[PDB]
């Protein structure tokens, strides 16, 4: 074989069913990257509410019709005002947690339509102005209500009082990539002719073992209608969509006074 000896001392120089959680119960699931949520490994005492925070919280129901273009949420932003989980978030400097997301949508055998649910790590969205990275904290953290997609890019032509809001586009996924490839991310498809619910399990993903839960969002959830809703020969159709999220294996550290962000 060919001979090789490394000269320098540095390595760089070298040549190259029912699910019950806590006091909540909901009656196949998808695990992101095949990794179940877990606590920090062996390699300041953390606080861990075993059941006061690891349970299912239900968000506000939304309506799906013939003109809906999609919805998106950010985690852990969406759960900032849910029981003691939010209190622990705002009373500590460092936090960590995984999630279990459950999407519910029921219809009849005479309806038709398909929804795509995508879980995206580090889901960064585009703005609505010539200025770059000018979106504000308040607009980037809607909370429980979340946001919506659009079919076109509407530039905010107002220099007097810029809105500083996102302008996602459905077929660009709001980030400049084609929607067809979004299936690279963890995903589920709800087809009304086969099923009525979707489930995803998300572990903690980040470049650090633990990070602030207030200034950084680890996950994004996007729901988009792949096929339009229809029902018999009716002009208008509307059905509800519900989202339920459960924290799992949550840890907090850095206890001090409480944080009170200015949301408008």
């Amino acid at each position: 074989n060919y001979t090789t000896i490394n000269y320098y001392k540095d390595s760089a120089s070298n040549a190259a069913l029912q699910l019950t959680i806590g006091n909540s119960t909901i009656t196949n699931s998808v695990v992101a990257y095949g990794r179940w949520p877990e606590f920090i490994r062996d390699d300041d005492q953390p606080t861990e509410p075993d059941v006061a925070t690891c349970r299912f919280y239900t968000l506000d129901t939304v309506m799906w019709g013939k003109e809906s273009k999609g919805w998106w949420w950010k985690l852990p932003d969406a759960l900032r005002d849910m029981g003691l989980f939010g209190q622990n978030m705002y009373y500590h400097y460092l936090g960590r947690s995984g999630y279990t997301v459950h999407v519910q949508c029921n219809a009849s055998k005479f309806h038709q339509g398909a929804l795509g649910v995508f879980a995206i790590p580090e889901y960064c969205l585009a703005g609505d102005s010539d200025k770059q990275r000018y979106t504000s904290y308040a607009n980037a953290n809607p909370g429980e209500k979340g946001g919506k997609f659009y079919s076109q890019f509407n530039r905010d032509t107002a220099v007097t009082s810029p809105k500083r809001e996102f302008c996602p586009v459905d077929y660009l996924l709001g980030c400049g990539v084609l929607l067809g490839n979004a299936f690279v991310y963890p995903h589920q498809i709800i087809n009304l002719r086969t099923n009525n619910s979707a489930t995803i399990v998300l572990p903690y993903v980040n470049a650090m073992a633990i990070d602030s839960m207030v200034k950084h969002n680890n996950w994004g959830i996007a729901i988009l209608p792949l096929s339009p809703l229809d029902f018999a020969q009716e002009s208008s159709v509307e059905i509800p969509i519900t989202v339920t999220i459960a924290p799992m294996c949550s840890e907090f550290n850095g206890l001090r006074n409480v944080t009170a962000p200015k949301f408008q």
């Binding site: 705002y90 009373y91 500590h92 400097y93 460092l94 602030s212 207030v214 200034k215 850095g254 206890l255 001090r256 006074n257 409480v258 944080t259 009170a260």
Partner: peptide
Amino acid sequence: YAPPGAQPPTSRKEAMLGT
């Protein structure tokens, strides 16, 4: 001592919640 993230303490009541 107070870790970062929240308002800097201005009174003993806020300070005593940290280390």
